[PDB]
Ligand binder design. Structure first.
Ligand SMILES: Nc1ncnc2c1ncn2[C@@H]1O[C@H](COP(=O)(O)OP(=O)(O)OP(=O)(O)O)[C@@H](O)[C@H]1O
Ligand SMILES: Nc1ncnc2c1ncn2[C@@H]1O[C@H](COP(=O)(O)OP(=O)(O)OP(=O)(O)O)[C@@H](O)[C@H]1O
Lengths: 385, 438
């Protein structure tokens, strides 16, 4: 009900502009379609899904319960990511458990050394949902049988040949990616089931190409090397005068993203993707959110530097971010409830839900530091039609 | 009070050892030759070190190194006799351990065994050779050396289940504890080992002449001086080993004499493991495996096989599955004692007893008379194995080196060894289950 009241609020019923044939993604010139397909044909210019869509909550149910028919390991490398095919032709990306729940990434780990936990992937969907951004593909947790749903249903000999039995008579496997894909990192169930996050598959690039931009606040991805924006305090004055980032609808998309990343601690947003058929005047897809929620006793302020430098925010999210701080609409109790139905719940160790609020007030206080230094009407854009 | 003193003051730890040593041919190092060799290595070090200081522009302050006979490692080397590595209740070893804990370091390298790998990272290799592991060799002001194994795990941490032996960690505290167990058993076979807290910057990085070793030191987002083994970090199989921010604790293991003075013989154990994710060796399946071993040279003399039995006991007490090879001193012959060099893996499961280590004793069913007496004694409460270990380990700067479940495991594992000796006595009699040789 605390969550049910959030969506009764008048900040969460502002509809998107009227759509036209050049604003949808898949013009349909549709009730037996699977929930993954309703999800695809509903992607418009300014969202990934509707606020009260019947398919998104049903697609979440599918990823958790639907039977798995084929599994394949992803191409190239970059951490262990598995593609799964269900009985309804639908696909989903899978990130296995890899790390615990009450655990923290050690302080001595750089941002490029961190794990990818299903926790952050599941949580990021709900957090992106509570903020009414709706820029993440739906993801649900699941307790997968690593025999009858991984090994015994894959023809990828590269994967299959890593399923070994452990000294503890447990079933292990490690795959063949680039980072953390050897026996010492082999994911192991007791005796034959781990958990992961089935992230729903975006539409195939065959019928929906997707741009991929380099975020101008990407880190050096190198020790002992700074990334310019760590040396220029008004580096944002250059980005507001670059090829596309000079448009008002674009300099803002990054702001909503960074407030998202800082709430989770995801300092690995080196690139972001558009939708091509949509050009430069759309939303930004929040993908690969697995490097968050790895620290609960730490708030990484370096993530928020894009907001501190540009000192601009959307009034849409500003009035939201305030409401999420009041105890009657608190991020803690809202997220903990939204994450109560995920089959893998509790998806978040409690102090992360608590930290989620502490991170909100430092974002909220950061807007105030921009508002008394640059004024109000020059920090908040307006949305009220 | 003090069960430890009671142990060494017992009639067992005092009776002369047979056969006695004539000398000269029962001290693996010849004095006049060894001093000349070491005196030359000291002269070459002084030369090639001053030149390094001149290239990097550093005033050659202080005099050059002096090789003194009174150094601990010197007297440690010249004291290695046919009866073991060190002497029983030796005052040199006490000084030796204290020296490795306090003397300053003057050099640090990568050791051979690495370095001789040339390349060589094969991120596909599951059991990469024992040269891609984090360990350095330090040199002290008295010219002595020591194999430094840094801390890799907390005290109350075990090798997680689903971890095979070949990927188990490399505990510094178990290198120390294995030495204290060695001295308590009067096996006298692993080199003396101390725990020490090392300023990784002042005592490793700032003293190494190796351009690669300087390249593996970095600083964390928490501002801690870290370093790493070049190969495992690239394959992402292990992490780094950071100070807090500079202070790091490790285990120094005293160096054996130089292989130019005392050659050694890396011999494959007869009970090696497969070292694969599957597949078992012959002994892992045939309870009559030792019937075969007893008929293979040089295990036919019935005196080398006994030394391996002692090793199996010592490894079972510490849970050291990874004993693929035992080294020997060639001067002492087929009957010479075995050196227990790298124990860094034992003491990783305090809740589990791996009986496959005891397979030599289980299947050969024969134990040395002396070894059985010390094991029987260490089962009696007045000198129980855990208490004499707990007390002996208190003399280390890294106390407590062993948590309580580990110490209590030694007692229980001792019963299993004694239960097997008495157990397989019933099938063979004290005739073939005790070898009271001199
Ligand atoms: N002047 C130098 N410039 C650059 N690198 C050097 C220099 N001198 C030595 N090194 C590197 O450091 C190491 C030198 O170690 P050190 O001089 O302490 O003893 P060593 O002679 O190499 O070893 P050992 O004592 O076993 O003969 C060499 O392996 C070499 O790679
Ligand atoms: N306590 C110990 N634990 C493990 N390994 C040891 C120990 N003592 C010696 N060793 C091994 O013995 C070897 C020492 O020989 P090394 O190649 O350093 O030549 P050296 O003995 O220094 O002789 P020189 O420098 O005069 O040629 C190293 O590979 C080291 O791994």
């Amino acid at each position: 009900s605390l969550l049910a009241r959030l969506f009764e609020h008048p900040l969460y019923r502002v509809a998107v502009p009227p759509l036209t044939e050049e604003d949808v993604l898949f013009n349909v010139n549709v009730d037996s379609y699977p929930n993954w397909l309703k999800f695809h044909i509903g992607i418009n210019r300014y969202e990934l899904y509707s606020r009260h869509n019947p398919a998104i909550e049903a697609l979440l149910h599918d990823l958790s319960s639907q039977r798995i028919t084929s599994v394949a390991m992803k191409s190239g490398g970059t951490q262990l990511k598995l593609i799964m095919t269900f009985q309804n032709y639908g696909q989903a990306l899978f990130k296995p458990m890899k790390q615990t729940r009450e655990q923290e990434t050690p302080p001595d780990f750089f941002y490029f050394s961190d794990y990818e936990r299903h926790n952050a992937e599941i949580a990021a969907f709900h957090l992106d949902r509570i903020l009414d951004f709706r820029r993440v593909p739906p993801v649900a947790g699941r307790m997968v049988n690593m025999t009858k749903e991984i090994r015994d249903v894959t023809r990828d000999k590269k994967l299959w040949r890593t399923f070994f039995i452990s000294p503890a008579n447990n079933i292990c496997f490690y795959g063949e990616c680039s980072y953390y894909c050897s026996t010492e990192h082999a994911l192991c169930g007791k005796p034959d089931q781990i958990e992961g996050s089935l992230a729903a598959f975006l539409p195939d690039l065959s019928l929906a190409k997707r741009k991929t931009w380099r975020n101008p606040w990407r880190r050096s991805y190198h020790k002992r090397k700074k990334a310019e924006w760590e040396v220029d305090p008004d580096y944002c004055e250059e980005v507001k005068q670059t090829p596309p980032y000079d448009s008002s609808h674009r300099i803002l998309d990054v702001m909503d993203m960074t407030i998202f990343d800082f709430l989770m601690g995801n300092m690995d947003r080196h690139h972001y993707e558009t939708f091509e058929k949509f050009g430069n005047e759309t939303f930004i897809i929040h993908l690969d959110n697995g490097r968050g929620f790895g620290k609960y006793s730490h708030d990484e302020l370096s993530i928020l530097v894009p907001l501190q430098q540009c000192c601009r925010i959307r009034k849409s999210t500003y009035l939201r971010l305030q409401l999420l701080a009041k105890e009657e609409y608190k991020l803690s109790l809202l997220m903990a409830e939204s994450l109560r139905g995920d089959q893998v719940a509790p998806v978040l160790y409690q102090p992360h839900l608590e930290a989620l609020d502490r991170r909100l007030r430092v974002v909220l206080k950061a807007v105030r530091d921009c508002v008394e230094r640059n004024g109000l009407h020059s920090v908040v854009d307006d949305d009220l039609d | 009070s003090s069960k430890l003193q009671a142990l060494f003051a017992h009639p067992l730890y005092n009776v002369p050892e047979e056969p006695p040593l004539l000398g000269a041919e029962d001290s693996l190092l010849a004095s006049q030759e060894a001093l000349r060799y070491y005196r030359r290595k000291v002269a070459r070090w002084n030369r090639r070190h001053k030149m390094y200081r001149e290239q990097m522009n550093l005033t050659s302050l202080d005099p050059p190194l002096q090789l003194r006979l009174e150094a601990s490692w010197v007297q440690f080397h010249l004291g290695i006799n046919r009866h073991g590595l060190y002497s029983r209740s030796s005052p040199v070893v006490s000084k030796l351990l204290q020296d490795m804990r306090h003397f300053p370091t003057i050099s640090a390298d990568y050791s051979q065994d690495e370095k001789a790998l040339l390349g060589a990272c094969d991120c596909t290799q599951i059991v990469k050779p024992s040269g891609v592991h984090l360990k350095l060799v330090l040199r002290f002001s008295d010219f002595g050396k020591a194999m430094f194994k840094p801390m890799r795990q907390q005290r109350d941490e075990e090798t997680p289940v689903d971890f095979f032996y070949f990927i188990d960690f490399q505990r510094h505290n178990a290198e120390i504890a294995a030495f204290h167990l060695d001295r308590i058993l009067d096996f006298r076979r692993v080199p003396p080992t101390v725990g020490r807290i090392v300023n990784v910057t002042k005592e490793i990085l700032e003293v190494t002449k190796n351009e690669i070793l300087q390249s593996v030191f970095f600083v964390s987002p928490a501002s801690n001086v870290c370093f790493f083994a070049k190969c495992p970090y690239m394959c992402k199989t292990e992490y780094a080993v950071c100070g807090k921010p500079h202070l790091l604790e490790g285990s120094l293991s005293a160096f054996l004499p130089s292989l130019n003075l005392a050659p050694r013989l890396s011999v494959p154990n007869p009970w090696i493991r497969s070292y694969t994710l599957a597949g078992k060796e012959e002994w892992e399946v045939n309870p009559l495996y030792c019937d075969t071993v007893k008929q293979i040279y040089p295990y036919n003399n019935s005196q080398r096989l006994l030394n391996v039995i002692d090793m199996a006991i010592f490894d079972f007490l510490i849970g050291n599955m990874d004993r693929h090879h035992y080294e020997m001193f060639t001067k002492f012959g087929d009957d010479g004692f075995l050196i227990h060099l790298d124990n860094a893996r034992g003491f990783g499961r305090h809740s589990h007893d791996e009986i496959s280590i005891l397979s030599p004793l289980s299947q050969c069913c024969m134990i040395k008379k002396k070894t059985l007496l010390h094991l029987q004694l260490l089962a009696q409460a007045d000198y129980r194995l855990s208490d004499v270990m707990r007390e002996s380990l208190l003399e280390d700067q890294l106390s407590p080196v062993l948590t309580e479940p580990h110490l209590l495991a030694l007692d229980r594992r001792l019963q299993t060894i004694l239960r097997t000796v008495e157990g397989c006595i019933v099938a063979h009699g004290q005739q073939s289950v005790i070898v009271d040789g001199p």
